[PDB]
Write a protein that binds this DNA or RNA. Structure first.
Lengths: 611, 183, 579, 605
DNA sequence: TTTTTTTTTTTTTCTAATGCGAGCACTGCTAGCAGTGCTCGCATTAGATTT
């Protein structure tokens, strides 16, 4: 760190990490910090062997970065490459060929140096970039004339008579090839006869290849960039050639027309424009140029049938016992369920790449976790300072001052929420639930039932889906005894509070939920817990306990719907998710209605009893 | 003679910005850091502010801070600049010499409670909104009072920030550093 | 999303064994499967096993032929390339798929692993960058398209009919950056003092005018442009319309604020025979009327003759090859026996591989036989080779044992050979005219060859073409030529594991039989060519395999091996290669 | 410093690189006694010892003359407790310190916490449950017909019914499982109106399945009403799945916050329970839960560091507490012997040891030899020598010309199987045939090992016509394979065998389910597999073969031990064969596996 | 040197501007009161380029 003149931190370095791992091996993380390093719990077992291997790597990586720093005379550089290769590498049947090439090339360089009598110390960055050039310099021409059709670049002084010569990539400026003279060269100033210059070499090759082809010459170039449909051009040589052809010949169709007109006519007859896509049916129209690829044929014929609407009704039979966790997991994202729950498809996105820098600020689920721990500490009225030390040692927070600052704005938000939590909290005991709803036995567990009712708190923004969760978990609670309220507190002072309900209405609404559940496993029920929630926010009127009708608001709920579905350029919209991508690529106003109808069905009892 | 081009200059640039924000911020004591935090969280945003100015010809900065001034210097300066008004308002408090007017609403005197309360520590960078009431340009529109009553106007004339200095130092540094690493 | 689907597929084909990571790939819109498909396909085990199977063949195509061949096979079998084009809009999707594949080639070569490619694709799914080649290709050039383009990217271009829907819009610059009117120098004011803000916002407006100009000069026949009573300030009903801050508005109002009515009038004022204004009335009838297309019958031609027959230039190495079936041919012996019984300057310890052997050979390539060995010369060979000094005193002795060993019955010492009688590393090309069939040969071999009794008949596919090889050494003694070939190998042994018997054993194990016979054919034809009045029996001395490690000062026989082609086998063999 | 010293023991391979690196980081710059001491702690903890009693490290001084290392400065630091306990890398348990020094035993913080949890759970936490002795005795009387002699099993049931936490030790085929069924029956029929939640856990999904089928068939035998047959547990699961161990993390959905909701828990094959999983289990239990462990005292110990069931059963040797013997004498309606003296009442009472094996007796050479394993070698060479018992044979392997002959007998070991394949039979009887004979080798690799023996045996199949092999396919018909890791999809578990064969539908692998059904899986479908001609002794635990053949390598390696050989011996149902040197084996039996833990000290104090 | 397990979810912007609502001082009109002029504060809504 200090070598690069960045202030010594003491965190986020392979020393910090390793020490964190080993210390994670000796002592459980829950014990606490030690030197202000938090033991990293994950490797506690025999697995931890790997760590020792890892730490043996880095030591070497450390040692050598010191050994390579100082300049050296060459014969001091001779022994190095061997120590390094055999140091870091274990040769094998494949590799030994390679490693021998490394030593051979390296020591070839240095030997070139010594034999020239060069005394001064040398920086490594001189040789490292010589050897890079030396290792790729080699070419393999072995199979040239083996007999398989020959692909190869145009090489000076290689001209082999052939029956068929093909030329690709004649686009202007790509060929001929350009390497300017050095510019302080004296030869390029006053040329004599026998001078060789790369451009004249290419220009002469293109003549050789012409003289060499004994039957069919084939010349190709990219007319139009496939990507933008820009224009491209033929090399000047091809241009001269097509010019000469067109000026020396005429098609038999018009034997009296004109010089230039017969010219552009011929030049049109010789030039073929192949299409942009292989499945373009023009290729397959019977004629002279016709494609032998039969794999694209049915595509060009346009003989395929379109993809049916993904949703098809599927039979399902509700068991007698539904574990409450199954219902909970269902209603969280009712669409996602039918993919994972029912038919078992789940799309696992690739894991996130390791970030490149120590955390400057905390965002996303990173800071969310911290709010979770922090809050669960404040509600217990345990000291936040201890936990602070835990994170700091964990290297999790921004360094130093900003750790303190960020920490003490968060403590100031989660303190605000924390009190409001502490106000109503009466410690309570978990309860197990068994019920008969529509001849279906629900079993489950509810943690921490206080005499007053359900209390739940999450450091989140107020959103409906949370609401549905507390709604289910509430109705099951009313459904078995449990007179009392249910409350949920969230950030920016959000709240969901559901008054108590009699066993009758409890079992009736719970019925509606379950019926939703067997509805789900059959067809991918479309209920969007947020966007639909947004649409139902506008229409419903709590004072009249009736959803509004008038079309003025019905163009409010649409704008507030789409606004919720697709997001801003800031917040990602509910509408963008892999689970909703599989159903429709583009939202039809019809499907919009379909969502509004079902959402109106299940969601309504939420807003109706919320207070 | 052989130049290897690089078309992604945003990654080197961002790299350098994190380098700056490491050496010129990590050393800050709590109280100055508190001021840095407000104007931008971290170099991710700072880069977003100066980014158009890192690229292409360097602009000329109107009335640049002197070359020798640090953050602690500017900060101590502004500390005292507010402090004088703090003592002074604490001294002149407790008197109605003003000509009372309808539109200026009598509860405006409650503002003064705030200010005599607002005068405790220097840790805040933000003066109170109620201060806008004591501007002689503000009040005289609705009674010259005494000088410090006018001094608040001097205090509120130039916005109090560390911003210009940081954008200056960072803009000069990040440019060089990038150029060096590419060299 | 198509890149993502591609990820799900490649990731599945990589490890179809896993139930989940496959089914995921099946559900993709690309595969185009219903919920009923996946549902039933979760039930019947046979179908599921069939899918697993086909993907398992795909992995094979993946490993052998590369990537793009695989995705080709998958597209054909699944019929997706067709079913997308059937689907509406799916044309775009299909272009994306093909494009991505084309990139998986470009990154596919440079990376050797099959797996590190799936490594790579994810990493690009995360960071898309800006870069040119990964930028999207135009969806279709078949149909003329609406070419919807930004102002700046229209500069110097020409657009026969031109639309400026949003032109009214404006952006008030909050940043303060301007130019001094005097010095004409770019000045940034880090302070928000309103003057400089104004001095800049004037600039922002003039620039907006220049945008308007450029935008209007683009059209050839017709340009249409939108106009609205746009309001920036958030108060609803005033009589404030900020359009005078729009580039265009200022040109209609002559830089005068108006009301929306005044806006409408000022539009009406200039409107004669060129400019014509209609009110903006939202309406929807029909998306558009395609009326579709008619094409034809169409078919692909199909080759009749074979693409091409067998003409190959091969060495004897291209003969042993590998055996598919009950018998597989390898240099090493599969059977192994464990040993439970319980000076470093030796030949057996020398390193092994193509690399060590190439060194060993390359010694004798320049090496001088008549002079004894110079240890300095050794050290500087090993040094060049990269071999340490652990070798130089160990080698320089051994070589002398080699050069000093007498050979065959003539008792020739390698040392006795003058550079006039040496020929080092002859490369030859031997044409084989009619296809050379194994069984039509190995019978001729076995017939006259005692050594070909061992092991099955050599098997190589029909071949017609040229044959290559390097004679290690050719030299003449007593007016009589010889053929010399060095071999090294033998990881396991040092001592008499090289005998008259075991040498002949290994010869039959690595099939150096056919090899030496082939060379003898070559050397034969070369002498018949070069030597006026050449005769096989008169001038020719036999064949010598020298196992370098095999040479020991103790036993003259160990390591050297000699046999003579029958002169009756070559007589017919040469004829065979002639026709 | 002594750092570069420690760089040698890696060349000497006396220290793992992990050990050295650990000692470097944690030990810091302190007196080299700290550094070396720590490295040795990490080493012994690596080989599976829980602690490092200072006696050993001060007495050996093998890594350095701990005079000069141990005596540094500041007067006398030579006291190891002094010098070590001085530095901050060691503490008494007060601070959050990497290492703990408590009983003269220096050892890791993690091991000390898990250690203490285990201890306190076996001593104070378990309680005495009280019921009517007359009614209970009657229930047992209807469970167990024969009253005429002392029944160990009846004692075991009585004990486990009295004590909240109880262990039942015994050899393979001593009737453990049946006994457990008897117990559970007494449990359900004991509490009529109370909810009885039974849970069945085993450390390996394979053993879990074995337990499922076992207690299914065993519980079906005894009369129960539909209520009881509802309170019969459904299935058994993995220990992990029970604790709900998340695949990536170390988090547990239960731990101390969530007690897993049970009445009783039965962990079969507790020998494989190691210390970390034992503690992490214990944190999940409620205060009403009754737990029972199953395993042999001498079974091969768990891989990860610790020995639990061993250190526990070691105290069974003393026997029952004086009074508990009288209580049980009232319970079983018999005379229960009483262990003389007082050591620990709570622990001694919790342990029952089943000394009767119904599978084979003393006349069978397997029980006599296995019973002679716990003794010295002069008994084992005797048994292997005299009378031959017809159930046991030893073949000398020294020269490879003997080894070839070993393979020669291995043929006839597989003979019936090989023919049944040549006879071209149906898969079921083939699979059942494959379990009569098995090769067991300790090491994985080399001349003697699963990895080597698969090669040599198949090569020996190519020498003598038995089963033809195609090199390119890699799946010649008849090759047995086994699964590397558990699978939820195909319902097959790690440690399970299946036979590759072509029924004519195609090349397909055939597995025998615990339900008797045969499932054919495509080769591509299999998750992981290893050629199963030879098993390591470890993986063979819980299995039973009619004829087993043990192979011990010639060298002396820390893997070859007493318990390894023991499990190999008890592995065969009836027939057995051995291949070893009398010196390598005879010395191997003398060396017992010890893993140092304070438990022996903890239960006495 | 030997080896066992298990499956998944979470969050989301900030700044600013107005519109109104509530509370108050004055002042004029018929000492109190109503209105108006006013002013601040709370919630709600809107917008965030160009190779």
């Amino acid at each position: 760190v200090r070598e690069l003149e960045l202030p010594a931190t003491g965190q986020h370095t392979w020393r910090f990490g390793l020490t964190r791992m080993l210390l994670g091996y000796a002592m459980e993380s829950a014990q606490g910090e030690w030197q202000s390093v938090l033991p990293y719990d994950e490797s506690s077992g025999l697995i931890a062997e790997l760590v020792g291997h890892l730490a043996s790597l880095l030591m070497q990586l450390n040692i050598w970065r010191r050994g390579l720093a100082q300049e050296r005379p060459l014969e001091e550089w001779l022994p190095v490459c061997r120590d390094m290769l055999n140091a870091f590498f274990l040769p094998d049947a494949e590799t030994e060929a390679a490693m021998t090439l490394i030593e051979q090339q390296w020591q070839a360089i240095i030997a070139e140096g010594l034999g020239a009598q060069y005394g001064d110390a040398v920086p490594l960055s001189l040789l490292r970039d010589e050897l890079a050039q030396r290792l790729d310099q080699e070419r393999i021409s072995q199979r040239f004339l083996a007999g398989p059709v020959n692909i190869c670049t145009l090489m000076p002084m290689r001209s082999i008579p052939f029956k068929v010569v093909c030329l690709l990539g004649m686009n202007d400026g790509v060929y001929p090839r350009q390497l300017a003279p050095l510019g302080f060269d004296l030869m390029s100033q006053k040329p004599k006869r026998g001078d060789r210059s790369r451009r004249d070499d290419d220009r002469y090759l293109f003549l050789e290849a012409l003289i060499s082809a004994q039957q069919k010459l084939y010349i190709s170039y990219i007319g139009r960039s496939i990507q933008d449909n820009s224009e491209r051009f033929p090399s000047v040589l091809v241009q001269e050639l097509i010019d000469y052809i067109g000026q020396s010949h005429y098609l038999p169709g018009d034997e009296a027309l004109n010089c230039d007109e017969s010219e552009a006519r011929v030049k049109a007859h010789l030039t073929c424009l192949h299409t942009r896509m292989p499945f373009d049916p023009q290729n397959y129209q019977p004629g002279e140029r016709q494609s032998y690829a039969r794999e694209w044929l049915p595509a060009a014929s346009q003989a395929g049938k379109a993809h049916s609407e993904f949703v098809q009704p599927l039979p399902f039979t509700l068991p007698e016992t539904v574990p409450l966790e199954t219902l909970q997991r269902f209603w969280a994202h009712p669409v996602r369920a039918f993919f994972q729950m029912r038919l078992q498809v789940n799309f696992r996105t690739e894991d996130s790449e390791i970030p490149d820098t120590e955390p400057f600020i905390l965002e996303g689920l990173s800071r969310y976790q911290i709010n979770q721990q922090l809050l669960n500490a404040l509600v217990e009225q345990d000291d936040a300072e201890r936990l602070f030390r835990r994170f700091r040692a964990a290297g999790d927070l921004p360094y130093g001052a900003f750790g303190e600052i960020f920490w003490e704005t968060q403590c100031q938000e989660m303190q605000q929420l924390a009190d409001r939590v502490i106000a109503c909290r009466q410690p309570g005991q978990s309860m197990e639930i068994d019920l008969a709803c529509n001849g279906v036995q629900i079993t489950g567990w509810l943690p921490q039932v206080q005499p007053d009712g359900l209390l739940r708190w999450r450091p989140s923004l107020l959103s409906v889906a949370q609401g549905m969760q507390l709604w289910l978990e509430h109705l099951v609670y009313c459904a078995s005894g449990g007179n009392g309220e249910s409350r949920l507190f969230l950030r920016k002072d959000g709240e969901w509070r559901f008054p108590p309900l009699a066993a009758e209405q409890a079992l009736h609404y719970l019925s509606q939920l379950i019926e939703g559940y067997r509805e789900g496993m059959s067809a991918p029920l479309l209920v969007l817990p947020e966007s639909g929630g947004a649409w139902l926010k506008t229409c419903y009127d709590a004072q009249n306990d009736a959803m509004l009708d008038d079309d003025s608001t019905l163009q409010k709920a649409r704008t507030k719907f789409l606004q919720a579905y697709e997001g801003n350029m800031m917040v990602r919209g509910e509408g963008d998710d892999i689970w909703y991508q599989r159903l429709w690529r583009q939202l039809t106003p019809e499907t919009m209605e379909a969502i509004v109808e079902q959402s109106q069905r299940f969601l309504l009892p939420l807003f109706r009893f919320n207070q | 003679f052989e130049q290897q081009l690089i078309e992604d200059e945003s990654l080197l640039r961002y790299q350098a910005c994190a380098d700056f924000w490491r050496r010129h911020c990590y050393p800050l004591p709590r109280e100055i850091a508190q001021v840095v935090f407000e104007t931008w969280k971290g170099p991710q945003a700072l880069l977003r502010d100066i980014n158009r100015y890192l690229q292409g010809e360097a602009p000329v900065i109107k009335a640049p801070p002197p070359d020798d001034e640090t953050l602690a210097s500017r900060h101590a300066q502004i500390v005292a600049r507010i402090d004088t008004v703090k003592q002074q308002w604490r001294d002149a408090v407790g008197e109605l010499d003003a000509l009372i007017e309808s539109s200026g609403i009598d509860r405006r005197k409650f503002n003064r409670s705030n200010q005599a309360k607002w005068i405790d520590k220097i840790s805040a960078w933000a003066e109170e909104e109620t201060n806008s009431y004591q501007l002689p340009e503000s009040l005289e529109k609705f009674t010259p009072r005494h000088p410090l009553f006018e001094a608040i106007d001097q205090l509120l004339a130039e916005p109090l920030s560390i911003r210009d200095l940081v954008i200056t130092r960072a803009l000069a540094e990040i440019r060089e550093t990038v150029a060096r690493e590419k060299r | 999303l198509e890149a993502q689907e591609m990820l799900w597929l490649l990731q599945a084909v990589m490890t179809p064994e896993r139930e989940n990571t496959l089914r995921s790939a099946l559900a993709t819109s690309m595969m185009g499967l219903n919920a009923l498909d996946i549902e039933t396909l979760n039930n019947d085990e046979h179908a599921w096993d069939v899918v697993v199977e086909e993907f398992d063949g795909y992995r094979q195509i993946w490993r052998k032929r590369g990537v793009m061949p695989m995705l080709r096979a998958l597209m054909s079998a699944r019929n997706i390339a067709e079913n997308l084009l059937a689907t509406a809009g799916g044309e775009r999707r299909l272009t994306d798929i093909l494009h991505i594949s084309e990139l998986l080639q470009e990154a596919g070569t440079q990376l050797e692993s099959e797996h590190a490619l799936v490594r790579w694709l994810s990493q690009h799914i995360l960071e898309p960058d800006s870069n040119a080649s990964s930028q999207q290709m135009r969806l279709e050039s078949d149909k003329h398209l609406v070419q919807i383009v930004t102002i700046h990217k229209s500069k110097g271009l020409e657009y026969p009919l031109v639309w400026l829907p949003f032109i009214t819009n404006f952006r008030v610059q909050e940043q303060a950056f301007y130019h001094d009117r005097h010095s004409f120098e770019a000045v940034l004011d880090l302070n928000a003092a309103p003057e400089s803000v104004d001095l800049a916002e004037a600039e922002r407006l003039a620039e907006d005018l220049r945008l308007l100009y450029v935008a209007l000069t683009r059209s050839v026949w017709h340009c249409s442009l939108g106009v609205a009573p746009l309001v920036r300030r958030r108060g609803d009903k005033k009589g404030d319309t900020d359009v005078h801050q729009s580039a265009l508005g200022r040109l209609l109002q002559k830089g005068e604020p108006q009301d929306a009515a005044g806006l409408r009038t000022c539009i009406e004022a200039l409107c004669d025979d060129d400019i014509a204004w209609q009110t903006a009335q939202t309406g929807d009838n029909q998306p558009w009327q395609v009326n579709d297309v008619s094409t034809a019958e169409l078919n692909a031609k199909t080759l009749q003759r074979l693409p091409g027959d067998n003409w190959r230039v091969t060495s004897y190495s291209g003969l042993q090859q590998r055996x598919x079936x009950x018998x597989x041919x390898x240099x090493x012996x599969x059977x192994x026996x464990x040993x439970x019984x319980x000076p470093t300057l030796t030949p057996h310890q020398f390193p092994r591989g193509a690399s060590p052997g190439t060194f060993l050979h390359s010694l004798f390539e320049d090496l001088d036989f008549t002079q004894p060995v110079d240890p300095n010369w050794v050290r500087e060979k090993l040094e060049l080779g990269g071999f340490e000094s652990q070798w130089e005193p160990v080698l320089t002795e051994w070589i002398t044992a080699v050069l000093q060993a007498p050979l065959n019955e003539t008792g020739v010492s390698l040392s006795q050979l003058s550079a006039r009688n040496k020929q080092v590393e002859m490369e030859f090309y031997l044409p084989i005219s009619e296809p050379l069939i194994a069984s039509q040969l190995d019978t001729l071999i076995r017939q006259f060859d005692p050594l070909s009794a061992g092991c099955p008949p050599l098997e190589f596919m029909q071949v017609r073409g040229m044959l290559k090889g390097f004679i290690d050494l050719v030299f003449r003694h007593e007016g009589r030529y010889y053929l010399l070939a060095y071999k090294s190998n033998w990881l396991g042994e040092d001592s008499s594991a090289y005998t008259q018997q075991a040498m002949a054993a290994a010869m039959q194990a690595h099939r150096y039989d056919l090899q030496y016979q082939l060379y003898t054919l070559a050397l034969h034809r070369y002498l018949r060519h070069r030597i006026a009045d050449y005769d096989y029996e008169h001038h020719f001395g036999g064949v010598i395999y020298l196992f370098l490690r095999g040479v020991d000062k103790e036993h003259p026989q160990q390591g050297i091996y000699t046999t003579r082609p029958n002169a009756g086998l070559i007589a017919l063999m040469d004829e065979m290669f002639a026709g | 410093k002594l750092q570069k010293q420690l760089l040698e023991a890696v060349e000497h391979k006396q220290l793992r690189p992990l050990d050295v690196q650990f000692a470097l980081t944690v030990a810091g710059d302190e007196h080299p006694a700290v550094t070396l001491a720590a490295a040795l702690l990490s080493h012994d903890a690596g080989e599976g010892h829980v602690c490092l009693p200072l006696s050993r490290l001060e007495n050996n001084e093998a890594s350095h003359p701990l005079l000069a290392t141990c005596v540094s400065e500041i007067g006398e630091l030579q006291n190891w407790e002094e010098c070590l306990l001085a530095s901050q890398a060691v503490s008494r348990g007060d601070e959050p310190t990497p290492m703990i020094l408590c009983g003269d035993r220096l050892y890791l913080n993690r091991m000390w916490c898990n250690e203490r949890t285990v201890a306190r759970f076996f001593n104070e936490v378990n309680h005495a449950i009280e019921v009517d002795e007359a009614l209970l005795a009657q229930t047992l009387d209807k469970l167990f017909p024969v009253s005429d002699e002392i029944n160990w099993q009846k004692v075991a049931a009585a004990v486990a019914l009295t004590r909240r936490i109880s262990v039942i030790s015994g050899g393979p085929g001593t009737g453990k499982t049946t006994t457990v069924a008897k117990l559970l029956a007494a449990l359900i029929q004991m509490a009529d109106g109370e909810r009885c939640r039974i849970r069945l856990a085993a450390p390996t999904g394979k053993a879990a399945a074995r337990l499922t089928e076992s207690l299914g068939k065993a519980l079906r035998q005894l009369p129960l009403t539909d209520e009881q047959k509802k309170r019969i547990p459904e299935d058994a699961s993995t220990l992990h799945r029970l604790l709900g161990a998340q695949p990536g993390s170390q988090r547990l959905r239960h731990h101390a916050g969530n007690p897993l909701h049970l009445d009783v828990l039965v962990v079969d094959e507790a020998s494989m329970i190691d210390l970390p999983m034992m503690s992490r289990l214990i944190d999940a239990l409620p205060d009403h839960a009754r737990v029972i462990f199953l395993g042999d005292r001498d079974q091969l110990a768990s891989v990860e560091a610790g020995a639990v069931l061993g250190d526990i059963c070691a105290y069974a040797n003393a026997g029952f507490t004086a009074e508990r013997a009288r209580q049980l004498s009232r319970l079983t309606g018999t005379h229960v012997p009483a262990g003389t003296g007082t050591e620990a009442a709570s622990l001694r009472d919790s342990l029952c040891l089943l000394q009767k094996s119904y599978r084979f007796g003393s006349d069978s050479g397997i029980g006599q030899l296995a019973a002679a394993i716990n003794r010295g070698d002069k008994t084992a060479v005797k048994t292997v020598f005299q009378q031959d018992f017809t159930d046991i044979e030893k073949r000398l392997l020294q020269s490879g010309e003997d080894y070839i002959a070993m393979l020669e007998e291995a043929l006839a070991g597989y003979g019936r199987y090989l023919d049944l394949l040549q006879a071209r039979a149906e898969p079921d009887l083939i699979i059942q045939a494959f379990n009569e004979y098995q090769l067991l080798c300790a090491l994985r690799e080399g001349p003697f090992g699963v990895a080597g023996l698969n090669e040599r045996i198949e090569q020996f199949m190519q020498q003598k016509r038995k089963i033809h092999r195609h090199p390119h396919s890699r799946w010649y018909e008849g090759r047995p394979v086994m699964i590397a890791r558990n699978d939820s999809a195909l319902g097959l578990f790690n440690g399970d065998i299946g036979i590759a064969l072509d029924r004519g539908q195609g090349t397909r692998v055939w597995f025998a389910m615990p339900d008797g059904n045969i499932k054919s899986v495509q080769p591509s479908r299999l998750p992981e597999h290893e050629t199963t001609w030879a098993m390591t002794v470890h993986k063979s635990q819980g299995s039973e073969f009619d004829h087993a053949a043990l192979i011990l390598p010639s060298q002396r390696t820390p893997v070859v031990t007493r318990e390894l050989v023991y499990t190999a011996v008890t592995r065969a149902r009836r027939r057995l064969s051995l291949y070893a040197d009398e010196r390598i084996l005879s010395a191997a039996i003398a060396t017992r596996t010890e893993r140092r833990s304070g438990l022996a000290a903890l239960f006495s104090s």
